[PDB]
Amino acid sequence: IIIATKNGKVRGMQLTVFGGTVTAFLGIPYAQPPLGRLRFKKPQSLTKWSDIWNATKYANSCCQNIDQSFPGFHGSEMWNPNTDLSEDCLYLNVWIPAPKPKNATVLIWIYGGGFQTGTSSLHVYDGKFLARVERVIVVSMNYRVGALGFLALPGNPEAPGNMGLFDQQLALQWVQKNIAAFGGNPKSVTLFGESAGAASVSLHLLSPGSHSLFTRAILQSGSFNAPWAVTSLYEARNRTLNLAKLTGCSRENETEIIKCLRNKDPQEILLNEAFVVPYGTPLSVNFGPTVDGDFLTDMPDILLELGQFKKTQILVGVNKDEGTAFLVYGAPGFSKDNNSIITRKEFQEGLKIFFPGVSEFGKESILFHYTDWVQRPENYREALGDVVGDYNFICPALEFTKKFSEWGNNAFFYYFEHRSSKLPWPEWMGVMHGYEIEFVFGLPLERRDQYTKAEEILSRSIVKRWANFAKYGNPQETQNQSTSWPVFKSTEQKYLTLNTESTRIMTKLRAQQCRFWTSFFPKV
Amino acid sequence: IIIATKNGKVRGMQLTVFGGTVTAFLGIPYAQPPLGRLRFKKPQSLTKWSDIWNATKYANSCCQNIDQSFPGFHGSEMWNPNTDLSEDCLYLNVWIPAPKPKNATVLIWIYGGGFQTGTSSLHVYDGKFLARVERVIVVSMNYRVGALGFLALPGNPEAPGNMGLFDQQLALQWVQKNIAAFGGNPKSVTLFGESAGAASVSLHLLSPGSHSLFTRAILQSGSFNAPWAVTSLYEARNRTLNLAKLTGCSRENETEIIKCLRNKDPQEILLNEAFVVPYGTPLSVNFGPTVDGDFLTDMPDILLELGQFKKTQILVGVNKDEGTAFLVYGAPGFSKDNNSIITRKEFQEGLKIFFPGVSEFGKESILFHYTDWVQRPENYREALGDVVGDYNFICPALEFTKKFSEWGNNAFFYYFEHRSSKLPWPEWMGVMHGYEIEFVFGLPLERRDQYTKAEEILSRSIVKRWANFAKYGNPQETQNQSTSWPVFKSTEQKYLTLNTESTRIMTKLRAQQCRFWTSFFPKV
Ligand SMILES: *[C@@H]1O[C@H](CO[C@H]2O[C@@H](C)[C@@H](O)[C@@H](O)[C@@H]2O)[C@@H](O[C@@H]2O[C@H](CO)[C@@H](O)[C@H](O)[C@H]2NC(C)=O)[C@H](O)[C@H]1NC(C)=O
Ligand SMILES: *[C@@H]1O[C@H](CO[C@H]2O[C@@H](C)[C@@H](O)[C@@H](O)[C@@H]2O)[C@@H](O[C@@H]2O[C@H](CO)[C@@H](O)[C@H](O)[C@H]2NC(C)=O)[C@H](O)[C@H]1NC(C)=O
C-alpha cells in the first residue's frame, strides 16, 4: 500500500486486528532532523524525496533520561522508550481503517512525560484498535523533550523555547496538508493527550498558530495551569545558565553559549539536565513550555482568564489517585513493595519533598487542610497522595474546565475511577496517573490479553464516547441505554464517573480541596 | 405630671430642649430589687404601690468593675457609671414628647459594655433630643451585668444564666403593659443598642419570649455571632467554679455554691470576676449570654442559619475603626499619648494579646492575611486595629445581616465613617467604636456644645433615618434630596456610608477580610 504525500510516497504495512485489517504507517518523517546547527532551533521543513519511504516500523524516540528507579519492573518500565534514542526523532505514525476510509475523523495523540520524557511508540499508545473499532484515523508524533525541546533564551532564535511544542505544531500541519491522501478529513481533527501531552493540548487551544490546525480537544490528567506545566522566564534563564555552567559553556554573548551547547554530545546535555535546579521534586519539569512571544504570546493564565483561546468543545478528565505514582520517587516511608503506612512526621517530610521552596506556613496550611481526620493508619499515606494529585492535576483540570466553559462552549468532565486488574503497582496506589490510557486506546478489547469482561466493556464504551466526541462534539454512547454525559457549566459543575459498575452523574468534584489550592494557596 | 401605671402613679419632670418641652421619667422601677435570695435569679415582678413614685432622677447603676486605665481622661471616663452602683438597679427611664403624644412610636435603648459594664444614665444615652426632635418616646433600662447578670449553672434556677437578658425582657414587658398610658404605641416598639447592647438586640430576635414585645431592631456595632458575645456552656461552668474557688465557695451540691455566693459582698464578687479565665483580652466577656434552655433554646448560630427568629426589618451597621479602642488596653507599643508606630514583632505580640489560646498557625495566618503590604510606618499599627475590628465587630455584623436577609426581610447596613471633632482619643484611633452613639442620640443638635455645623446636619439626618426606620421600617430621609438607602441583599450587599461630606452607596464591605474570618478562621 503506497500513499502519495506532498513530500514523497510512503509504504505502510497491513495489520490484523479483530478479524479485520488496519493499515499502519509507522515512522513517517515530518521535519529536517534537528541535528548540528538545528539543535535547539524550531523544526525546519522537509525536502521532497524520490523512492518509496518505508513506514514499516517505529522510528527513533528523542533523546531523554530514562526512569531507572525500578529496573525489571513493568509498572515503571512500560513508560520508558522502546525505540533507539536519537536526536533524529521527528517522525509520526498514522493508522488508517481498512478498507480505506473516504473522509475519516482524525485523532491526534500527544504523549506525556513531563515534557522531559516520552515517545509515541509505547504499547499503550498503539492506535490500531481505535482505527479498527471506530474507523477513525489515529496520528501520533515524536516531539523533542527536555533541554533539547525546551531550552530557552527568550527572543533568540538559536534557542527560543517551545521547540517541542513547535514540533507538535508542525506535525498538525503535516496532517492538514497530507491526511486527505490517507482518507482523512483535515476539517475533523481532534487532539488528545495525557499529562504533559494534555497540557500541550491546552496550549494549542491558546496558540493562534495552532487555531486552524485542529477542531476539538481532549485533555487527560493535564492542563497548562497545573503548577508544573509552564516554566517562568526567570526560572528558564537560571536553568539555561546553570546548564551552561555545568557543561563548560558559560559565555556572555548568549549566542556563544548556544553555539557551545551545540557541541556537547546529546548525552552530556541529558546528564546535566537534572542538576539545573538546586532542589527538584518527582514532579520536576526542568525544561518546559515558556512564554516565548511566538507560540505563547502572554502568560497563559491571563489568556484563559480573558477568553483568548480557540472557541470549541473540550473533554477533560482526571483519575481518582493521580498523586500516588509520584510518592515512591522520593517521599520518606513510601514503597511500592509495602503498604507505606507513614507517620505525621513522614507526611511532614514528604511536603518538604513535594514543596521544596514553600514557606513553613505554606506547608503547615497544607497539613492543616489535609489532616482534619474524619485514627485509621493509612490517614497520612492517603493524605499525601491527595495533596499531590489535587495540587498537581485535579484542581488545575477543574479550574481549566470552569474557566474555558465560561466563554460559551460545551465542556465534558470525567472522573476515572477504575483500577486495571493488570496494574503491577500495589493496591494502595489505587487508580493511578496514566492508567486510563490503555482504556482510551482499547487495549481491553483484545481478549487474549487477560483483562476482565467488565474491563472490555468499560473500554468499548470509553472508545465509543471519545470517538463520538471527536466526530460529533458529544461524548455520548447512544445505543446501549447509557448514562447521558451532561455538559459541565461553572454553576453546576456536573461530571461523569467512569467505572465498571455504574456511571454516575455527580457535582463539584473535590470542591473543598480545590477552594484551598485555587483560592488560598496561590498566595503563600 | 402624674401618670398612672399598672403598679402605681409616677411623677416626671419637665425639660427644656430646643425651645420646646420634653417630659422625663427617670428611674421607674420594673422588678423586685434582686437582693438577698434573689441575687442570681431571674427578675421577679413588682408589687403595686400607693403614693406617687418620684421618677425625677436616674436610679442606681448595677454593680460593675470600672475602667481605671486612664484616670481623669474623658475618652474613657465618659463610659464609666454616673450614678451610685447598687444591686438595687432594676430601673428604667422614659422620655416623652410634650405635648403628650397620642400613639407615639417607641424607641428602646439597650446599652453595651461587654455584658460586664454599662448604665442607661450616661450622657451619650440621653433620650430627650430624640423625644423633642422626632416625637418618639425613648425608653432605657438598667439590667444586671457581669457574674451578677450572667453567672450560669445550666438548668438550676438558682443561677440559670442570662438573668440580665431576662432583665431587658421584663423591661420590654413593662413597655408592652404600660407605655399606652404615656401616649406610646406598644405595637410600634423598636429596640436599639450598641456592641453588647446590639448583641442583646440580636438575641431578642431569637428569643421566642421576646417575639411579641417589640416590632423592629437596630444593631449598632454588635450581633450575637461576634466571637465575644456568647459564653459556651463549657467556659461558663469553668468560670462559675473558678469564681467559687476564689471566694471560698467551692462545694459539690451546686445549690450550696450559689447559696455560698449569695453571702459574699457584691464587691468581693466584682473583685474576683477578672480572674475566672487564665488569660483575658481587652475584649473579655467573662460572664455573658449562654444557651440556657430558657431565653436561648439552642446555639444561636444554628437558629440564624435555619431561620428561627423574628421575621421583621433590621438596620445594622459598624464604624470604620471598631478595633482601635481596644489596642491601648494591652497591646505592646500602643499609647493614646503617642502615634503608636509599632514593629512586626510588636504586631506579633499583639496577636498573642488578642488571640491568647490560638494555635501558632492560627496567628501566622492572621499575620499572613493582614500584612501583604500595598513600607509605610503605620502599616503594623493600622493592621492590628483592622484585625481586631474585622474579627470582633465588622465581619460578624455583615454575616449576621447576610444570614438574616436570606429569609425574606428588608435589611439596611451602614458604615459610619465620621470622627467627632470633639473626640478626646488621638487621630490614629480614627472613627472609634462607640462614637456613632452621640450622633444617633442627637447630641450635635445642641448648638451650645462645640460640634461643627457639618456634624449638626449629619446627626439630624441619622436621627431622621433612625426614626423613620422605627416608625415605618425604612431608614430614608425623604425631604432633603438625600441618597436613598438600598435594602441589603446577600447577592449585592449594598450598604450606605454615613459621613459629613457625601453619603455613598457601596458594595461588599470588607469582602476579602470577611472571607478570611468567616470561612477560614473558624477552622484553626
Ligand atoms: C539559580 O541557580 C543558582 C546556581 O546554583 C546551582 O548551580 C548549578 C550549576 C547546579 O549544580 C545546582 O545544583 C546549584 O545549586 C542557584 O544558586 C545556588 O543555590 C544553591 C542553594 O540555594 C547553592 O548550592 C549555591 O550556593 C547557590 N549559588 C549561587 C551562585 O547563588 C539558585 O538557587 C538559582 N536560582 C533560582 C532561580 O532558584
Ligand atoms: C478552668 O479553670 C482552671 C483554673 O485555673 C484558674 O484558677 C482560677 C481560680 C483563676 O485564679 C485562674 O487564673 C487560674 O488559671 C484552669 O486551669 C489552670 O490553668 C492555668 C493555665 O493553664 C494554670 O494557672 C493552672 O495551673 C491550671 N490549673 C488547673 C486546676 O487545671 C483552666 O485553664 C480552665 N479551663 C478552661 C475552660 O480554659
Ligand SMILES: *[C@@H]1O[C@H](CO)[C@@H](O[C@@H]2O[C@H](CO)[C@@H](O)[C@H](O)[C@H]2NC(C)=O)[C@H](O)[C@H]1NC(C)=O
Ligand atoms: C516500606 O519500605 C520503606 C523502604 O524500604 C521503609 O522505609 C525505611 O524504613 C526505616 C524508617 O521507617 C528506615 O530503615 C529507612 O530510613 C526507611 N527508608 C525510606 C526511604 O523511607 C518503610 O519502613 C516500609 N514500611 C512499612 C513496612 O510499613
Ligand SMILES: *[C@@H]1O[C@H](CO)[C@@H](O[C@@H]2O[C@H](CO)[C@@H](O)[C@H](O)[C@H]2NC(C)=O)[C@H](O)[C@H]1NC(C)=O
Ligand atoms: C508610645 O508609648 C508607649 C508606652 O509609653 C511606648 O512603649 C514603651 O516603649 C519601650 C519599647 O518600645 C519600652 O520602654 C516599654 O517596654 C514600652 N511599653 C509598652 C507597654 O509598650 C512606645 O515606645 C511609644 N511609642 C512611640 C513614641 O512611637
Ligand SMILES: *[C@@H]1O[C@H](CO)[C@@H](O)[C@H](O)[C@H]1NC(C)=O
Ligand atoms: C522497502 O521495503 C520493501 C519490502 O518489501 C522493499 O521492497 C524495499 O526494497 C525497501 N527499501 C529499503 C530496504 O529501504
Ligand SMILES: *[C@@H]1O[C@H](CO)[C@@H](O)[C@H](O)[C@H]1NC(C)=O
Ligand atoms: C469531508 O467533509 C468535509 C466537511 O466536514 C467536507 O468539506 C469535505 O469536502 C469532505 N471531503 C471528502 C468527502 O472528500
Ligand SMILES: *[C@@H]1O[C@H](CO)[C@@H](O)[C@H](O)[C@H]1NC(C)=O
Ligand atoms: C554575539 O555574537 C553573534 C555571533 O554569533 C553576533 O551575531 C552578535 O552581534 C554578537 N552580539 C553582541 C553585539 O555582543
Ligand SMILES: *[C@@H]1O[C@H](CO)[C@@H](O)[C@H](O)[C@H]1NC(C)=O
Ligand atoms: C452495545 O452492546 C451491543 C450488544 O450487546 C454490542 O454490539 C456493542 O459492543 C455495545 N456498544 C458499545 C459502543 O458499548
Ligand SMILES: *[C@@H]1O[C@H](CO)[C@@H](O)[C@H](O)[C@H]1NC(C)=O
Ligand atoms: C416627690 O417629689 C415632690 C417634689 O415636688 C414632693 O412634693 C414629694 O413630697 C416627694 N416625695 C418624696 C420626697 O419622696
Ligand SMILES: *[C@@H]1O[C@H](CO)[C@@H](O)[C@H](O)[C@H]1NC(C)=O
Ligand atoms: C395606635 O396604633 C395602632 C396601630 O399601629 C392601633 O391598633 C391602636 O389602636 C392605636 N391606639 C391609639 C391611637 O390610642
Ligand SMILES: *[C@@H]1O[C@H](CO)[C@@H](O)[C@H](O)[C@H]1NC(C)=O
Ligand atoms: C442539694 O441541696 C439542695 C438544698 O439546697 C437540695 O434541694 C437538693 O436535693 C440537694 N441535691 C442533692 C440530691 O445532692
Ligand SMILES: *[C@@H]1O[C@H](CO)[C@@H](O)[C@H](O)[C@H]1NC(C)=O
Ligand atoms: C432639611 O433641611 C431643612 C431646611 O434646609 C431643615 O428644616 C431640616 O433640618 C432638614 N431635615 C433633615 C431631617 O435632615
Ligand SMILES: [Cl-]
Ligand atoms: Cl474519590
Ligand SMILES: [Cl-]
Ligand atoms: Cl519560612
Ligand SMILES: [Cl-]
Ligand atoms: Cl452506564
Ligand SMILES: [Cl-]
Ligand atoms: Cl475603610
Ligand SMILES: [Cl-]
Ligand atoms: Cl500551637
Ligand SMILES: [Cl-]
Ligand atoms: Cl446625602
